[PDB]
Design a protein around this ligand. Structure first.
Ligand SMILES: [Zn+2]
Ligand SMILES: [Zn+2]
Ligand SMILES: [Zn+2]
Ligand SMILES: [Zn+2]
Ligand SMILES: [Zn+2]
Ligand SMILES: [Zn+2]
Lengths: 240, 74, 72
């Protein structure tokens, strides 16, 4: 909910891990750090939602007023626009709440946005993300995307800032992105090409049972098949 | 900055973009290098379809992060 | 340690400072590099204008971070 110096970002290098973050702000128009804020931010929505706060750009040729917040890693000097995504669900365990998985008081921890605000440590959250990813247990929402709910199974606890899944590690994160793109195609009514090695994302018309893997140069393998059996194209008797 | 656009088949493309660039601008850069008309392009990041009016910073897409491209030929 | 000052003319000044240096000392170092007197200098960091009484450690300004200079 509220804010503070307990910011945590994911540094993609040289840290390749979750690190304490620095909150910065730039003018929403000229994209320069010359905008002053008459009041500081009070909640996460103030820094996560665009045009949620106003200020005044101190440039003589810029009347910008929109505050644009961003984050940088705080474990080492960073360039002026070397940003890192902020993990708003990760904060310091000031209440010293034990992990709901390993039953160990750790710091920092991730707090799900369920009704009970369940607490999990980063190590357990990493294992929780990997196992559900390999088991294809991730959930896809047309509004949020490819995410996971609370580890305890609470409703309406899907993680909204999908960059929290950077804890999967570099290899498993690109697999997560790939699985999300695949489930996204299936969500739009499309179908994945059954020919191994191709794995294309095809979006044919809803009525056509004919699927012509075809996009252009290297965009399709040219295999014609049926949406239902996914074996080979036919005119009838979809059974084996 | 640089971002990557990958198809589900495995083909990868590199683009020179800015965080303020819109998804519509991203699809235009794709056409300038691949000849794919933007109307047939559907960009996906972390399983979420990217709206043409939105920007990369709206999705917090960082440098050298990967966008997924699926074609819609209707 | 080093800190950076970005000006309206695009150029980035590199200053040698200590965490205990005051904002007045930093403005003096900016005059030694660009000739801008400190009465015309305004420094912006983290959406706040820096006052001449505090120090770099008072504003959590760490090594090799960037200040933004605008003229009065
Ligand atoms: Zn770092
Ligand atoms: Zn401005
Ligand atoms: Zn744990
Ligand atoms: Zn829960
Ligand atoms: Zn195919
Ligand atoms: Zn069939």
């Amino acid at each position: 909910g509220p804010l503070g110096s307990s910011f945590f970002v994911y540094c993609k290098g040289p840290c390749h891990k979750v690190q304490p973050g620095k909150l910065r702000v730039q003018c929403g128009t000229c994209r320069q750090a010359t905008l002053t804020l008459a009041q500081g931010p009070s909640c996460w929505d103030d820094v996560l939602i665009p045009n949620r706060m106003s200020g005044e750009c101190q440039s003589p040729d810029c009347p910008g007023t929109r505050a644009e917040f961003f984050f940088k890693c705080g474990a080492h000097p960073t360039s002026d626009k070397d940003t890192s995504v902020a993990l708003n669900l990760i904060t310091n365990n000031s209440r010293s709440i034990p992990c709901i998985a390993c039953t160990d008081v750790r710091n920092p921890v991730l707090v799900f946005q369920c009704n009970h605000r369940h607490v999990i440590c980063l190590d357990c959250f990493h294992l929780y993300c990997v196992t559900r990813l390999n088991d294809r247990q991730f959930v896809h929402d047309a509004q949020l995307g490819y995410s996971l709910p609370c580890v305890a199974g609470c409703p309406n606890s899907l993680i909204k800032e999908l960059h929290h899944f950077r804890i999967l590690g570099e290899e498993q994160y690109n697999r997560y992105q790939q699985y999300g793109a695949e489930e996204c195609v299936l969500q739009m009514g499309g179908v994945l090409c059954p020919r191994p090695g191709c794995g294309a994302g095809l979006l044919p018309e809803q009525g056509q049972r004919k699927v012509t893997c075809e996009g252009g140069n290297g965009l399709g393998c040219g295999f014609v098949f049926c949406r239902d059996c996914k074996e080979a194209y036919h005119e009838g008797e979809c059974d084996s | 900055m640089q971002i990557f656009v990958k198809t589900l088949t495995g083909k990868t493309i590199t683009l020179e973009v800015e965080p303020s660039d819109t998804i519509e601008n991203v699809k235009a850069k794709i056409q300038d290098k691949e000849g794919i008309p933007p109307d047939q392009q559907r960009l996906i990041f972390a399983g979420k379809q990217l709206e043409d009016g939105r920007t990369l910073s709206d999705y917090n897409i960082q440098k050298e992060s990967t966008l997924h491209l699926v074609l819609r030929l209707r």
